[PDB]
Amino acid sequence: SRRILLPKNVIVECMVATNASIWLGCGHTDRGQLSFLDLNTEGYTSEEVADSRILCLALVHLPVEKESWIVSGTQSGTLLVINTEDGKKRHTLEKMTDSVTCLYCNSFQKNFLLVGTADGKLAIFEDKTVKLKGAAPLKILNIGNVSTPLMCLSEVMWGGCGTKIFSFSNDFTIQKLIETRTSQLFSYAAFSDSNIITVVVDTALYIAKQNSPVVEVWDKKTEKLCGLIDCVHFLREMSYSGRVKTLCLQKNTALWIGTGGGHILLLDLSTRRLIRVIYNFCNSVRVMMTAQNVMLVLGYNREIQSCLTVW
Amino acid sequence: SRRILLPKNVIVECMVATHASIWLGCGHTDRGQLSFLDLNTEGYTSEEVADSRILCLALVHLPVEKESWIVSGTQSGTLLVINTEDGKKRHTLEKMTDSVTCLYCNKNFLLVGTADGKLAIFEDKTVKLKGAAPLKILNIGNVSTPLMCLSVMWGGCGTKIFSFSNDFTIQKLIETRTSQLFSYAAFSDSNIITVVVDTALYIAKQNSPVVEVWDKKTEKLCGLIDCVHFLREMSYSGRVKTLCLQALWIGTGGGHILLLDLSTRRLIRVIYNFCNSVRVMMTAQLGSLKNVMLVLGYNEIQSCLTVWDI
């Protein structure tokens, strides 16, 4: 477990891992700046590659043809594809009608690039088609509207659009559509009327909402509330907001929760709840993800100092 | 609405009103101290009447024979009955096997819940007889599940809600620990301290900021009210101490009082820092057509009784 300090005032919007290194989208700038961080040497390099802020990143790897492409989704809707080995090899896919708010690589075996936009749409690209300039998506799913951003995808595929959880499979048709805005069992109603920010898929669906300390648990079959995890009460065992910022699952049993503060919770998902709790791990946990085995946690302190902890 | 300051360092464990004045059990003392407060003159008098702390009060009124008796249940299990008009008329009913933790007036009956999970029933008249035995004793729980609230009659024993109507059968027996799946597990694993019955059951648990709402028929959770989250619209504990129906009043461990709607579970009113700690909140009839709201709080201790009309 070591901490890697990023250059001062660097803000990280998005992050993807691959001498291990990571690609970063920068949020301290209104244009599209792509950064590269060597985890072994802690070296940081960046380049302006697009006209609008890079919101989300995805790494498309082609085992045949031996090529890795880094895909940047931007605030203007542009999908910029850049070659990992030769930066002079870069092009743009079809422009989205709104900002790109989600990038996921799925596999069905066929691999795909799923592109969620801010106007509630989900564009699907095939593995190979990412190499082609001006490439069009195989299909576009109109799941929401301009007011329901599609912000998270997890793996059948589950996703969050506004206050709705959606599911889709091979044919890319929306099978399950679950409205989470209403439930009589809600400990508090105002938290549940927020956009879903993250979805982790285990035996049940564990979702988090914007500016909400309550992780909701919904059932895949019955499409109803399974349970509630109130981070405020777990933290208090006292002025913590408990606002959930990120969810990360372990091998099978454990769930990491990064809160608005620097607090990280580790709960068991089988018969009890609380395993571990680290207070003031940073000032604010922003991103938490697994990579290949390894745990990456991006937090920031505030001038702004972003840090990447890894164990 | 007017507030009456009790003498300094007086602690009120239990409370019952009559017509206006109130009877108080004192908690600042290890023996059984009964106090009397005139709501018109704010005059306070007290007397040591028992050997152990008076935990509960009940006022048995007999319309025929025209007699009012004040019954005190104590920490040793003693049930002391005293005449309202003549204090020299006092006696003791059958000793309970453990401390008396609940006294309710319900043909009229006196229900006596104890700390070892038992409920003794006395008839209206039998309260006048020295050493009188109860009509029946229901063993609902055990030494570890005290019976602490009564409100058909519903009651709370440990983490279980029980029901009974004609005194010889426990009708409903509902385990409320099952709500571990929602909001918080440690809060739901606590003894029920108060129960209010309107259409669903609104229960509160010891050291819990979550008022649970259960269904009478399906015997399952209807909803949850988290006082911490309602108060935050910041270090408030939100620990519920008292529930009252009017709308639902909630007095918290702090000095905070919430007034929520039932049909819609929406927030009507919120009074912050009403005192340092709300302890009791109840309705009383101070005379003919006189419905009144009494709130006992405390603030080195200063207990106060706020009183307003409904």
Numbering used by the authors:
A (entry chain A): 2141 to 2158, 2164 to 2253, 2259 to 2305, 2314 to 2395, 2408 to 2462, 2468 to 2477, 2488 to 2496
B (entry chain B): 2141 to 2159, 2165 to 2251, 2260 to 2304, 2314 to 2395, 2408 to 2420, 2424 to 2476, 2488 to 2498
Show sentences the authors wrote:
LRRK2 is a large multidomain protein with 2,527 amino acids (286 kDa) and consists of armadillo repeats (ARM), ankyrin repeats (ANK), leucine-rich repeats (LRR), Ras of complex (ROC), C-terminal of ROC (COR), kinase domain (KD), and the Trp-Asp-40 (WD40) domain. The C-terminal WD40 domain of LRRK2 is required for LRRK2-induced neurotoxicity and has been shown to mediate the interaction of LRRK2 with microtubules and synaptic vesicles. The structure reveals a canonical seven-bladed WD40 fold and a surprising dimeric state in the crystal. We found that the WD40 domain forms dynamic dimers in solution, and both structure-based mutations and PD-associated disease variants in the WD40 domain mainly impair its dimerization.
Here, we report the crystal structure of human LRRK2 WD40 domain determined at 2.6-Å resolution. We determined the WD40 domain crystal structure using the single wavelength anomalous diffraction (SAD) method and refined it to 2.6-Å resolution. The ordered part of the structure extends from residue 2,142 to residue 2,498 and has a few gaps, and the last 30 residues in the construct are disordered. The first six blades run from β2–β5, β6–β9, β10–β13, β14–β17, β18–β21, and β22–β25 continuously, and the last and seventh blade contains β26–β28 and β1 from the N-terminal end to complete the fold, forming a stabilized ring-like structure. There are two WD40 domain monomers in the crystallographic asymmetric unit, which are related by an almost perfect twofold axis (176.3°). The interactions are centered at blade V but also involve the surrounding structures as well as blade IV and VI. The dimerization interface is large and buries approximately ∼1,200 Å2 surface area per monomer. In addition to surface area burial, a number of potential hydrogen bonding and salt bridge interactions exist, among D2388 of one subunit and H2391 and S2345 of the symmetric subunit, among R2394 of one subunit and main chain atoms of M2408 and Y2410 of the symmetric subunit, and between E2395 of one subunit and Y2346 of the symmetric subunit. Notably, the WD40 domain mutation G2385R is located at the dimerization interface and compromised dimerization. Therefore, the WD40 domain dimer observed in the crystal is also a bona fide dimer in solution, instead of a crystallization artifact.
